[PDB]
Amino acid sequence: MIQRTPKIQVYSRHPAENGKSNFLNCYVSGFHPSDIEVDLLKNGERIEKVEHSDLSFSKDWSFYLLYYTEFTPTEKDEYACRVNHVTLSQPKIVKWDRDM
Amino acid sequence: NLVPMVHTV
Amino acid sequence: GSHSMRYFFTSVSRPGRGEPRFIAVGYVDDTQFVRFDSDAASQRMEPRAPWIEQEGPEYWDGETRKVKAHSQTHRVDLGTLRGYYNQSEAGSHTVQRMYGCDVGSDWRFLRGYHQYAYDGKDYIALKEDLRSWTAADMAAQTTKHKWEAAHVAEQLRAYLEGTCVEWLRRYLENGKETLQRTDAPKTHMTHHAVSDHEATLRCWALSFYPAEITLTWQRDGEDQTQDTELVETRPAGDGTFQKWVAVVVPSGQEQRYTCHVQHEGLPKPLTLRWE
Numbered sequence: 502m503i504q505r506t507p508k509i510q511v512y513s514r515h516p517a518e519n520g521k522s523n524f525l526n527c528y529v530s531g532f533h534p535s536d537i538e539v540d541l542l543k544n545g546e547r548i549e550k551v552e553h554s555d556l557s558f559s560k561d562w563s564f565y566l567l568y569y570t571e572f573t574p575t576e577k578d579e580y581a582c583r584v585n586h587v588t589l590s591q592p593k594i595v596k597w598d599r600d601m
Numbered sequence: 602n603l604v605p606m607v608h609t610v
Numbered sequence: 611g612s613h614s615m616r617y618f619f620t621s622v623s624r625p626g627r628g629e630p631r632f633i634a635v636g637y638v639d640d641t642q643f644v645r646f647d648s649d650a651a652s653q654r655m656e657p658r659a660p661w662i663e664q665e666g667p668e669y670w671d672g673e674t675r676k677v678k679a680h681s682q683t684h685r686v687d688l689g690t691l692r693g694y695y696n697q698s699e700a701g702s703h704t705v706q707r708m709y710g711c712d713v714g715s716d717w718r719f720l721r722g723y724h725q726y727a728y729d730g731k732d733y734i735a736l737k738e739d740l741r742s743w744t745a746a747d748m749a750a751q752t753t754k755h756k757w758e759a760a761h762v763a764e765q766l767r768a769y770l771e772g773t774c775v776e777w778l779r780r781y782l783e784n785g786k787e788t789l790q791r792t793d794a795p796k797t798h799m800t801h802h803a804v805s806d807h808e809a810t811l812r813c814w815a816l817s818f819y820p821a822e823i824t825l826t827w828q829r830d831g832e833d834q835t836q837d838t839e840l841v842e843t844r845p846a847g848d849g850t851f852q853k854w855v856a857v858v859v860p861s862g863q864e865q866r867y868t869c870h871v872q873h874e875g876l877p878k879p880l881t882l883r884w885e
Contacts, residue, residue, distance in 0.1 A: 502729055505730070508842065510841065510842070510844050512844065512852070514846050514847040514848060515846075515848075516816075524847050526844075526845075526846075526847055528844045528845065530842060533704075533730040534622070534702070534704055534729075534730070535620060535622055535704060536622075536702075554642075554845075555633060555635045555642065555645045555647065555658075556620055556633045556635070557618045557620075557635050557642075558618060558620065558706060558708075562706055562727045562730045562731070562732075563730070564620075567845050567847060569847050600800075600802070601800070601812065601854075602673070602773055602774075602776075602777035603617060603636075603673055603676040603677060603680065604676070604709065604765075604766070604769045604773075605676060605769070606676075606679065606765075607679070607680055607683045607707075608683070608756075608757060608760055608762050609683050609686045609687055609690065610687045610690050610691060610694075610726070610733075610734070610753040610756070
């Protein structure tokens, strides 16, 4: 019963521009078992209105999910994704990097 | 269109 | 090009009270078109693409009946598997099933699949000939004998070669405006200086459909894989996909490096440079 830890990517739906409405995504994949906690953060704070895709899996049986919320980027606001899973001893945080 | 029956293991 | 219909099912037992959490999703190619979630209030198979909303109330009744039947089979399976593996009632366990069909550019049957996993490991799978089974261990061997006696392979073969491909064709036709359209990747390159002597070039592919794509780097016209990073293809959230590949290069030598993009929506592969 070797569990698999999630891969994480945090990114925007459309090309990110200040003042323009968009969606912030956290894609978690490659994990098992299926129970997982995913938060999107704005300036370190949990964003309340977050939706996610329906659970599915890849050929190797590992699960993936997309978590997403509408947001209008600004120059000052910092965004991130915080993930917990049985395989993680502490929550994993990945910052959104719009310069990528 | 789903298969019309599955079988238990 | 090629197409597929695939269904994915996950059941997760809930120790202490009640039935497992069951989630079913159906896809044509990279497009989800239906879902069922046992935790959801409707207790109906639900549409997830506009072109499936063309189907009438009978369809929704039928898919609801079958998917609930799938859920019950998984419920019983979780208990049987706990018995096969001598496990307690205490822990949560998972069963996963995937089945479906592939067709080529002519929409003719290419292959079919039906695979089953317990706790994330192979359990039993239909072989490519759709006539026999691959059982990973002795518990699955017991299942194999049961399924042989019940002629399950024969039933699945008929569905996979018949119904599966027939309804895939139907969906392709009804959803033609999106399902038969390719969206070529929109590409660009970015640049970052790591230090005075090292730079990163990142080649981006955005807004593409279907998900399959290849991105590569060349240095002076020769394939370059060392010092590259290629991320997993990821959903944009609007039905399209994104990917990038990066390379670390000596600062000032950017001009030697080219990115190469292959995708079904590109009549010929595309090349990008930094300049």
